[PDB]
């Protein structure tokens, strides 16, 4: 059929778009007119990739199919982040292969089994009561300030405390853990231009290796002991593997949940009836509708290891496919009224945590718990909050971020 009605050279990974808005109409145009579409990229404008473009994947069933066929659609070959600075050196993409998100089977399989021996429902539930306390204190301190930046005073801290609690980081070390975690989220936005994620990653690995050595001597009620203790087959994270796991957790556990919280509250501010309902019933289905609405990871990619036909389109060996979770999470064929914010939506088969498959978010239930606990505290302590001014968005080609959002907590 006809080509989609998009500006010439439009690139769905263009960070300049996301600094200002989400390209919702443009994704909807692809879903209607070209649901798998070649996103050409001019020379040097590939965000670190120099292959002329990628396939934009906009439908939820195609996202699931790619996520399920990890034997064809590789994470390792080019990593899963689809956009860096245009001049990033290839070696700096490939160094990301040392974290489990960017590996393939069998290396991925071994690492995930280890990381899931201690990253369990029991381990996550053991954090509930401390995170609930922490959420209530966060919302109370914010309410006591009267007004301020919702991102920094409400959204930022609880995800970081969840990472610290899961790893057993002593309170005296949490400040520098949080600092490293914030540094690692990138430097593509002018506000963050001076951050050095490479150096912070190196500092975190050093910290984590020391922790691994200490905790081997003195086991404790954290997941760490389960990770570095050999099983029957002698399987365990090496000290440097634990280091790369901590890097993985420090980055993955921070900005995505933060941005869920900020955008969830933005949604409630635009849909006051859903906010009234939330405050009365406190439904935990809210968390998934908030992750669907927020889609904190706009997109992750894969690389085809062989020719593969996907929904009538021929994907060729070596081509990238980019899974636009932001489009799939609003797919009219899967969701009833996707552009309605409905905190009781159930079932809610969103792909905010990725498609079912080998790389499905191991932190999904921790994130959901974090979200439910912070929104209960917000409802308890600042039920009448109202925004002062517009959110400031983050310049990124794949993360959907809110840097700042001024709010009057007393309303
Ligand atoms: C709302 C919050 C979050 C969102 C939107 C989110 C999103 C995602 C997505 C889309 C993936 C799929 C990776 C792929 O298929 O290439 C993923 C994987 C992953 N997430 Fe999350 N995530 C969240 C929170 C967390 C938290 C809190 C943690 C850890 C405490 C975490 C750790 C991980 C890890 C380690 C993986 C990689 C798993 C593997 O490669 O086997 N995430 N996440
Ligand atoms: C899964 C994954 C993530 C996730 C993974 C990586 C992530 C972030 C945020 C930043 N990075 C890394 C940034 N890249 C490019 C810029 N240079 C440094 C390296 C989140 C979250 C949840 N679940």
Numbering used by the authors: 17 to 427
Paper text:
Comparison of the effect of complementing a CYP125 knockout in the CDC1551 strain of Mtb (which does not express the CYP142 protein), with CYP125 or CYP142 reveals that the two enzymes are functionally redundant with respect to growth on cholesterol. Here we present a series of compounds based on an ethyl 5‐(pyridin‐4‐yl)‐1H‐indole‐2‐carboxylate pharmacophore which bind strongly to both Mtb cholesterol oxidases CYP125 and CYP142.
The replacement of the cyclohexyl group with a piperazine ring, 14, showed a significant drop in affinity.
